[PDB]
Design a protein around this ligand. Structure first.
Ligand SMILES: [Mg+2]
Ligand SMILES: [Mg+2]
Ligand SMILES: [Mg+2]
Ligand SMILES: [Mg+2]
Ligand SMILES: [Mg+2]
Ligand SMILES: [Mg+2]
Ligand SMILES: [Mg+2]
Ligand SMILES: [Mg+2]
Ligand SMILES: [Mg+2]
Ligand SMILES: [Zn+2]
Lengths: 184, 71, 59, 85, 85, 141
RNA sequence: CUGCCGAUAAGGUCUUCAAAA
RNA sequence: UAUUAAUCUAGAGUGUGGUAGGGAGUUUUGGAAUUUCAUGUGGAGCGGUGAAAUGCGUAGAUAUAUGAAGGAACACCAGUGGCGAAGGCGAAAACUUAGGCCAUUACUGACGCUUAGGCUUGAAAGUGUGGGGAGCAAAUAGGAUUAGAUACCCUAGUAGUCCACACCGUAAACGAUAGAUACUAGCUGUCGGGGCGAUCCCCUCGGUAGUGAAGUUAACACAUUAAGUAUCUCGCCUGG
């Protein structure tokens, strides 16, 4: 699998914390792939936990077997230098199969490009953008659909016998009943 | 008066995925002034996205990134 | 639920505070009485239907 | 989860025969083995019991079907799979 | 006998002599209604107004008060029948 | 002739057709389709000879593995059908076998009773003429 | 804007009718 | 029709490829709020009601600020919604795991529907053993009301509500509508997959709703998710 930890180390000193993260990484993770690490920075987290107001956020994008979680999970709490820890297994988050499909990825790039074009005209440099068309409806249908529209699997069948067919056609419904008026 | 501009952003962009450290400033818009997940009438996303963002923001609210009851 | 007075006027603060307290009072009074879970869902479903039908005609 | 690919390739009578009865029972036995482990470990998950009972009943009917038609291959499958007992 | 200018929302059984036509355009109705009136005037032996006539005499005007819009809207004036308890 | 829709049928071959004809009569529908079997083809051939339906065409695929018969009903000018009511005798479970002495007469001969004695499906009048009876499929009047 | 607020013996009529004017 | 000897894939399954879910169990984690306790400020009521009285309070209560402990349930999201055969499922994560939808030039080739007996699950209350107990509250005590109050109101209050393992197997367990299969106008919503490519909207295949004609019904009403036209199988009914 592909995991992603968001570790919460205390706010002591930068250089020594990075060492704490390397220590927390190299002890556990029995079997692992490449462990790329970043460093989002220093932020003042919202609610004070462990009586600390500053913390260093580390993100790990390693990958490995299911056993890589157990030892790390039971050791994080014991270590006084870690405030919280979340193992977000990204193979179960709300939407991953669509993200691996290549065709859906290119559409997202195209949607980004086209949407950026619309926002630009609206927030025009100084000239007034009269249409201000965004949330509103679009123009006539897309001719792309009209043509590339699917065709039902038209199973082709061949006639073998016949009898009595004459296609008379009696499509004259709700016709007039009365015909010509008369006097007794 | 009102507006009909209540429309899911992520649809026009096809973001297809919500991660709390990719559009963090975006999620603060969905939240209320008192750190609450605004409903559809205010937030504007389609139900499918509204569920995905809700899980991510509460996950963010568990990882201690956004307040609970105050600003 | 902090709202700043802005120190320009007082009424405006109470014009916003009336709204904030009403939505606050709804949940404050809700977690005052115990209904069975089935009855609890009924009042939740009841309020949504009232708000929906009311919202249809002003839109 | 079980490596479905390896088990099917063993039970193939010939290539592209990805839908016979013999391949089905081999796949079914593997799922039964896995589910018996899981259910014994948990003992309070009853939907897995529903799945286990449904799979067991489905396996019984298909092998019974294979007894009415072409009984000799039923003999071949049972000695390899050891499912009777 | 009853004749009518049905407009796609009518039960065809009730009318006998159906005359597929509009009913919302203040121009189509008058042209067709006068046409039946034109038969009556010819049967009564007074000169016709619109029937059996060339281009120049059929011109009629669009009443006051791009193209004309025969769209049916005002759907918001159809809420759910008052219910709930 | 082509279609666009999937064609399905019931497992019981007499009442499957019976539902199709009755529903088409009731819904004022004209053209319906179903899968082809030799009994249904045979009952329709005697049916069209007696004049309850106008045309009845059975078709087959280009691979010769499936056949579907698409029949139409014989409506008069005023759009009221010629069939009035259909009722099945040899229901599943209870197979109806009747000798000649108890061969039914439907509406004093106005309707037709379908009896497949020994030479495929066969009308009541000719069954009386041959003085031989057997399986009775359905009543159509 | 929620005080309080209980009881009521048995059996009973009444549509004669449209034949019709 | 039944039996036997065989062929075919459209029924039903399998695989590959798309894919939505509060589906389940096990193990960990989190914040508000209530209660109790600890420490400050403070100084006479608090509490409760239709109105009051038991009750709590100068032994410093209610209130306010901080901290600690502990148990239970998971606001907002949350729906003219989703999942499961039903009961049911809504803080976050990991592991294990069930079924389902769409497209299939693939495969087996009737292997399918129902099911007496049997087995599995089955809200809450209740039981047995061992833990747990913050809040609430059957039984119980007191104060009210009342002609009387063993009740409605209030103040206390045990079992219980919670967990593990064993039972009990009943509910208005309801859509008061058994399951399966084929057909029968339409309109408006909403959800998922697929096709196009800003959404929006259009089409296809399904799930979940509203309106609605033929048709059915004693009527109310049902009406493509039937209580309509028909078939199979099971369960059940025969006045109070
Ligand atoms: Mg009184
Ligand atoms: Mg505290
Ligand atoms: Mg219980
Ligand atoms: Mg007492
Ligand atoms: Mg109390
Ligand atoms: Mg008890
Ligand atoms: Mg019962
Ligand atoms: Mg209705
Ligand atoms: Mg009796
Ligand atoms: Zn969206």
């Amino acid at each position: 699998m592909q995991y992603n930890i968001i570790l919460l180390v205390d706010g002591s000193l930068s250089l020594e914390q990075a060492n704490q993260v390397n220590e927390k990484q190299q002890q556990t993770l029995t079997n692992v792939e490449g462990l790329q690490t970043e460093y989002l920075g220093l932020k003042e987290l919202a609610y004070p936990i462990k009586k600390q107001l500053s913390a260093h956020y580390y993100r790990w994008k390693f990958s490995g077997d299911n056993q890589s979680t157990k030892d790390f999970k039971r050791t994080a709490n014991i270590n006084k230098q870690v405030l919280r820890e979340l193992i977000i297994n990204l193979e179960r988050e709300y939407g991953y199969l669509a993200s691996i499909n290549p065709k859906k990825q290119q559409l997202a790039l195209q949607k980004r490009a086209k949407y950026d074009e619309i926002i630009a005209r609206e927030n025009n440099p100084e000239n007034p953008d009269v249409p201000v068309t965004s949330g509103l409806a679009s123009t006539q249908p897309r001719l792309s659909r009209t043509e590339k529209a699917q065709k039902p699997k038209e199973e082709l069948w061949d006639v073998v016998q016949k009898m009595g067919n004459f296609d008379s056609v009696q499509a004259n419904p709700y016709r007039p009943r009365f015909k010509r008026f008369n006097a007794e | 008066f009102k507006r009909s501009k209540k429309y899911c952003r992520f649809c026009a962009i096809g973001q297809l995925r919500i991660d709390l450290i990719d559009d963090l400033e975006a999620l603060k818009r969905f939240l209320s002034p008192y750190a609450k997940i605004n409903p559809r009438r205010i937030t504007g996303n389609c139900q499918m996205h509204q569920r995905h963002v809700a899980k991510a923001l509460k996950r963010a609210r568990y990882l201690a990134l956004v307040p609970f009851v105050k600003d | 639920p902090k709202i700043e007075v802005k120190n320009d006027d007082l009424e405006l603060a109470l014009k916003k505070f009336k709204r904030v307290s009403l939505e606050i009072r709804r949940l404050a009074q809700r977690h005052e009485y115990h209904l069975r879970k089935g009855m609890r869902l009924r009042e939740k479903r009841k309020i949504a239907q009232k708000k929906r039908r009311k919202f249809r005609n002003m839109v | 989860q079980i490596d479905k690919n390896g088990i099917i390739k063993s039970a193939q009578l010939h290539d592209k025969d990805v839908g016979s009865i013999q391949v089905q029972v081999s796949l079914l036995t593997s799922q039964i083995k896995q589910l018996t482990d899981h259910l014994l470990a948990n003992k309070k998950d009853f939907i897995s019991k529903r799945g286990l009972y449904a799979k067991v009943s489905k396996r019984k009917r298909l092998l019974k079907y294979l007894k009415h038609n072409d009984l000799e291959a039923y003999r071949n499958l049972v000695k390899t799979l050891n499912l009777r007992g | 006998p009853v004749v009518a200018l049905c407009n796609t929302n009518t039960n065809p059984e009730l009318v006998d002599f159906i005359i597929p036509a509009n009913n919302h355009q203040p121009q189509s109705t008058c042209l067709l209604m006068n046409l039946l009136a034109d038969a009556v005037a010819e049967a009564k032996a007074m000169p016709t107004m619109f029937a059996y006539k060339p281009d120049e005499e059929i011109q009629i005007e669009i009443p006051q008060k791009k193209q004309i819009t025969s769209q049916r809207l005002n759907i918001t004036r159809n809420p759910e029948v008052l219910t709930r308890e | 002739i082509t279609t666009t829709k999937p064609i399905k049928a019931h497992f019981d071959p007499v009442a499957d057709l019976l539902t199709k004809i009755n529903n088409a009569r009731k819904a004022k529908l004209m053209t319906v389709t179903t899968i082809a079997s030799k009994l249904k083809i045979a009952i329709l051939e005697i049916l069209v000879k007696e004049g309850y339906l106008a045309n009845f065409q059975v078709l087959e695929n280009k691979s010769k593995t499936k056949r579907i018969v698409t029949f139409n009903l014989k409506y008069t000018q005023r759009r009221i059908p010629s069939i009035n009511g259909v009722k099945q005798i040899s229901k599943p479970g209870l197979r109806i076998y009747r000798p000649f002495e108890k061969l039914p007469l439907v509406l004093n001969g106005l309707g037709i009773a379908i009896i497949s004695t020994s030479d495929g499906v066969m009308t009541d009048k000719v069954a009386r003429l041959k003085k031989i009876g057997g399986e009775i499929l359905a009543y159509v009047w």
